Design an enzyme around this catalytic site. Sequence first.
Site, PDB file in Angstrom:
ATOM      1  N   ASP A 171      -6.181   6.236  -5.055  1.00 21.89           N
ATOM      2  CA  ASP A 171      -5.706   4.855  -5.121  1.00 21.89           C
ATOM      3  C   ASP A 171      -5.738   4.322  -6.562  1.00 21.89           C
ATOM      4  O   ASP A 171      -6.008   5.070  -7.507  1.00 21.89           O
ATOM      5  CB  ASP A 171      -6.476   3.955  -4.130  1.00 21.89           C
ATOM      6  CG  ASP A 171      -7.922   3.661  -4.550  1.00 21.89           C
ATOM      7  OD1 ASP A 171      -8.339   3.989  -5.671  1.00 21.89           O
ATOM      8  OD2 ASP A 171      -8.662   3.067  -3.727  1.00 21.89           O
ATOM      9  N   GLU A 230       0.787  -1.234   0.000  1.00 24.22           N
ATOM     10  CA  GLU A 230       0.000   0.000   0.000  1.00 24.22           C
ATOM     11  C   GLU A 230       0.817   1.282   0.000  1.00 24.22           C
ATOM     12  O   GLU A 230       0.306   2.327  -0.398  1.00 24.22           O
ATOM     13  CB  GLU A 230      -0.973   0.017   1.181  1.00 24.22           C
ATOM     14  CG  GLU A 230      -2.016  -1.088   1.175  1.00 24.22           C
ATOM     15  CD  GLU A 230      -3.047  -0.966   0.072  1.00 24.22           C
ATOM     16  OE1 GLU A 230      -3.102   0.084  -0.617  1.00 24.22           O
ATOM     17  OE2 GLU A 230      -3.818  -1.936  -0.100  1.00 24.22           O
TER      18      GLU A 230
HETATM   19 NA    NA Z   1      -2.109   2.539  -1.964  1.00 18.86          NA
END
Ligand code: NA
EC number: 3.2.1.17
Length: 164
Positions: A20, A11
């Site tokens: 994202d 992440e």
């Molecule tokens: Na991310």
Amino acid sequence: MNIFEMLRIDEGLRLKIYKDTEGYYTIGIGHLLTKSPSLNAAKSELDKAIGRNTNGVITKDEAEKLFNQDVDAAVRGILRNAKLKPVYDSLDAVRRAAAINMVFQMGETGVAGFTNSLRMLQQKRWDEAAVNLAKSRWYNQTPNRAKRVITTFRTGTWDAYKNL
Ligand code: NA
Ligand SMILES: CCN1BC=CC=C1
């Protein structure tokens, strides 16, 4: 390696609101804020999550606090789901981390389409499960991350996260 280190690799860490891989406003270590295209809506969600009026910017400690909550929520969600819990219980701790990773990324009902994969994992048919997991929107849209998670399910080792 453990689930925290694994998801930190997958992440990243960003202290300002960003989009994202799906174009959704996010902050920290993959903390999804909202699917709304409104930045103001995202900032409101951030303030609510942190408990103060941010400037759309948080500290590392704050990011890590949300991250721990999100990992905990992913586990709790697996355990409350009648389809996921028995498969999760059947796994070793390394493969349990791979399971948490998927739920963190896609959500508990976002893994709803993985019925056949789930069966193969509970059967411990690891190569077959790995082939099935890759036949997915998930794999096509995030292939490098999916490959790492799938290798973790295939092998029960951390080999895909070494040198990272
Ligand atoms: Na991310
Ligand atoms: C499909 C991988 N997973 B996810 C959640 C629990 C068990 C297995």
